[PDB]
Amino acid sequence: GAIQLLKKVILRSTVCKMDFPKDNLFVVYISDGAQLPSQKGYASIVKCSLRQSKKSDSDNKSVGIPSKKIGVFIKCDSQIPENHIALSSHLWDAFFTHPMNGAKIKLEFLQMNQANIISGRNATVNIKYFGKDVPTKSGDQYSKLLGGSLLTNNLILPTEQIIIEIKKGESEQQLCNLNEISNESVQWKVTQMGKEEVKDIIERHLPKHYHVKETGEVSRTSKDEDDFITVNSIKKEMVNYLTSPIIATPAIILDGK
Amino acid sequence: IGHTDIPIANQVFISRVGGWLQSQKCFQNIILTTLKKFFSESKRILCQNDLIPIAFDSSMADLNIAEENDESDDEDELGQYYKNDSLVWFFVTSAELDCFSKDN
Amino acid sequence: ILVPVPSEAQRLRIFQWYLSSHELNRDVQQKVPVSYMDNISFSSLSSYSAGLTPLDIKSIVETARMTATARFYQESKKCGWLPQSILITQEDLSKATSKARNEF
């Protein structure tokens, strides 16, 4: 009964910032050089465990694996380099990571033949906002902010600090599309879950080091895009030499007084 | 002999072949993982007293990417993400089976 | 036992080794292959190779590969008629020798 799975492939993360039309929320960009059988799929980072010192690790033993498989739309691009992938910022936040090139994303498409998809009736989205300030963010407001979304059970957006387990009454669901559904048939619920289960959820899924808040970690600490135009006579060369396919020796030294 | 007629073993004792590579404590785990994968890829054919070489990318040593990447689909894009650099050998010392044949 | 700086024939053999195709195609991920024109006077290079070491020979051959690749890509951009491989000229190796003597 599960959705039949088309070709699955890995791809190199790219921070090359594209348009990423704001209309949709979870979409990506792939090179047009290859054929894309489907526009809908799942993406999943591949965690690289570097902290295996002192033997012990963070594998399935006493530590579960967060939801790597996250549904996202797919669409080609001619400018993006071949064998490369660009992710919407919302995707980066969903994966609990900042934009970063070179990350290897496992991905796999689907097909458009399925009735389990909620064909209209009762698309009860569980917007389980667990933040503070008792914000008046309405279900209608979130809808306006969440339209054009392919939701799936147990996924979190830390930017809004919102956890969602899409529900159809008491029947769950993993997929949905704005285009194929009527906006009336989606129901938005605004509440705050018990702080105990929220604490447990963050302890089990949100790592203690990750804090998506861009302003929380001040990076725009007076970093104006200063241009030292004459000295660019060197910069323009360096990048080329650095971007040159072949480097005679791996190193280049920049020297100054 | 036809591939059908080749008996299937149950327990196989393999003595790791002594080698400078096999010694490094920092490597052993990646080596045994490489063996587990290589046998997991598909069926294999072996003989008593034989030897098995493995080629692996030592650069992945401390990069202990978790096993939960079950049967990584694009092991080819991973292999090009890798580059097997160092080689090891393994000795098959015994195989357990209860289907006796002329060519055990 | 002392290992001397390579002599003329030693440098000749060093070149025979490095300029052998497969050695140049080690880390060539790009599809286009790499190779050299056959009009290269190896003896002249060996003679001009006075007072060098094999690692310097590696440096100079890689630098020649560089000038060749840069020129080839520039030509492909320029004319739009892409050739089917890469080539290295006596001039390129001569300038690499000059650069090597300089940095030495």
Side-chain angles (χ1 to χ4, degrees):
Chain A
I3 306 165
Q4 40 262 29
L5 169 144
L6 313 183
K7 176 62 183 298
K8 70 192 60 55
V9 73
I10 324 300
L11 217 37
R12 176 179 160 83
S13 71
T14 62
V15 195
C16 194
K17 168 52 180 141
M18 321 325 278
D19 49 349
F20 274 121
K22 169 61 215 70
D23 52 14
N24 299 353
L25 278 56
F26 303 155
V27 200
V28 300
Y29 274 104
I30 163 167
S31 43
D32 184 27
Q35 199 288 329
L36 322 175
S38 159
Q39 326 317 333
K40 180 165 69 184
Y42 313 106
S44 43
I45 75 179
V46 301
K47 176 55 173 103
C48 84
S49 171
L50 321 179
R51 291 344 301 140
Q52 84 300 19
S53 308
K54 81 203 180 306
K55 183 59 62 177
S56 198
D57 58 50
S58 170
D59 213 349
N60 210 147
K61 302 187 298 223
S62 68
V63 167
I65 174 65
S67 172
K68 317 151 294 314
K69 279 176 58 43
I70 307 294
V72 173
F73 270 128
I74 293 96
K75 63 200 198 290
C76 87
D77 166 46
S78 69
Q79 161 275 5
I80 185 178
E82 73 88 28
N83 203 356
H84 291 89
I85 168 58
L87 329 169
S88 147
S89 161
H90 274 170
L91 311 181
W92 295 91
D93 319 300
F95 273 121
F96 320 98
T97 81
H98 315 286
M100 169 271 267
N101 156 282
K104 318 189 159 67
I105 193 86
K106 157 75 154 284
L107 164 156
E108 74 297 22
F109 330 113
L110 305 104
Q111 52 71 26
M112 52 107 75
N113 182 39
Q114 49 186 350
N116 163 342
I117 49 162
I118 299 178
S119 322
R121 73 217 174 182
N122 171 14
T124 40
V125 52
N126 291 118
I127 309 105
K128 330 185 167 182
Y129 164 89
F130 51 97
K132 276 46 163 172
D133 187 37
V134 291
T136 323
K137 306 323 300 167
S138 65
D140 192 335
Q141 184 280 335
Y142 280 128
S143 87
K144 159 77 69 178
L145 209 152
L146 194 130
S149 317
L150 271 44
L151 257 289
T152 298
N153 175 283
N154 181 33
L155 67 83
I156 305 95
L157 282 84
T159 179
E160 176 49 52
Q161 208 217 83
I162 173 53
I163 179 154
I164 168 58
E165 292 61 28
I166 190 174
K167 182 70 73 173
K168 182 145 153 208
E170 293 335 325
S171 36
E172 83 316 332
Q173 172 58 5
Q174 306 306 96
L175 320 90
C176 70
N177 175 8
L178 160 62
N179 318 110
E180 199 172 38
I181 190 143
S182 59
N183 311 66
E184 47 76 12
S185 197
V186 47
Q187 303 72 20
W188 311 269
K189 188 267 288 185
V190 177
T191 43
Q192 76 88 16
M193 316 322 97
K195 290 105 170 163
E196 286 62 54
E197 198 189 7
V198 170
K199 295 151 187 150
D200 161 38
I201 284 159
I202 60 178
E203 174 47 49
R204 284 182 304 181
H205 319 89
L206 155 57
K208 334 304 152 284
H209 82 314
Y210 181 66
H211 325 298
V212 70
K213 322 318 168 186
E214 84 295 17
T215 305
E217 291 180 352
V218 296
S219 166
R220 61 215 186 236
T221 175
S222 181
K223 63 172 184 68
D224 174 17
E225 315 318 322
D226 51 4
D227 176 5
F228 319 133
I229 321 91
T230 51
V231 201
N232 305 342
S233 59
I234 308 94
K235 190 201 62 31
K236 173 182 280 148
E237 322 182 2
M238 296 203 18
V239 52
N240 297 3
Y241 201 92
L242 258 284
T243 35
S244 309
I246 323 300
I247 321 89
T249 83
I252 196 142
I253 177 59
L254 163 152
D255 203 340
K257 174 192 321 303
Chain B
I1 168 61
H3 60 327
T4 54
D5 274 9
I6 313 175
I8 196 83
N10 296 102
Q11 304 275 325
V12 293
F13 288 172
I14 38 157
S15 281
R16 162 142 42 79
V17 179
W20 169 232
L21 295 306
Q22 287 73 341
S23 61
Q24 278 67 247
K25 135 177 79 58
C26 35
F27 288 37
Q28 43 79 20
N29 64 322
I30 212 164
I31 323 303
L32 61 85
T33 65
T34 322
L35 281 311
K36 195 152 74 205
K37 300 137 199 179
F38 146 82
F39 295 101
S40 76
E41 322 302 13
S42 170
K43 56 170 167 260
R44 299 291 185 178
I45 306 93
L46 316 81
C47 321
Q48 191 65 261
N49 188 22
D50 215 296
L51 319 171
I52 313 324
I54 323 304
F56 68 111
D57 184 320
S58 77
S59 80
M60 235 68 43
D62 268 40
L63 315 204
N64 58 89
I65 179 144
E67 168 272 327
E68 294 327 290
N69 328 289
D70 223 27
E71 62 272 344
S72 72
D73 47 346
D74 208 350
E75 65 275 338
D76 313 278
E77 200 158 30
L78 287 152
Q80 59 95 44
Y81 286 144
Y82 319 157
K83 210 72 68 179
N84 57 349
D85 76 74
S86 299
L87 188 139
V88 317
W89 291 92
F90 279 96
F91 181 61
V92 53
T93 173
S94 89
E96 265 65 2
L97 63 99
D98 304 329
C99 313
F100 189 103
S101 70
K102 182 263 181 188
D103 193 319
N104 305 291
Chain C
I1 83 190
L2 202 173
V3 173
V5 185
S7 87
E8 185 65 358
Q10 315 298 19
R11 309 204 277 237
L12 158 65
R13 209 57 31 76
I14 283 168
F15 280 157
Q16 306 333 277
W17 164 257
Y18 270 169
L19 294 325
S20 81
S21 67
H22 143 82
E23 284 63 7
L24 311 75
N25 313 262
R26 167 174 307 174
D27 279 8
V28 64
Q29 293 64 350
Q30 59 286 67
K31 53 226 164 286
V32 55
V34 316
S35 297
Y36 77 118
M37 45 200 78
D38 291 28
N39 76 317
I40 305 304
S41 163
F42 272 0
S43 45
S44 59
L45 316 183
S46 61
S47 81
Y48 281 34
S49 60
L52 322 168
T53 88
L55 155 55
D56 325 292
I57 297 287
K58 196 188 175 112
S59 84
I60 190 184
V61 65
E62 218 65 45
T63 314
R65 175 189 200 132
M66 200 65 97
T67 174
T69 284
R71 176 212 303 216
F72 153 94
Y73 260 78
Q74 180 54 291
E75 167 274 1
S76 50
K77 184 195 288 183
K78 159 59 71 180
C79 83
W81 161 64
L82 72 173
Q84 282 301 331
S85 92
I86 217 168
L87 272 294
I88 319 91
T89 62
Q90 287 293 74
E91 176 280 344
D92 280 291
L93 272 63
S94 73
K95 297 314 209 307
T97 44
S98 74
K99 144 72 151 163
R101 286 317 213 266
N102 166 348
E103 52 72 27
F104 164 88

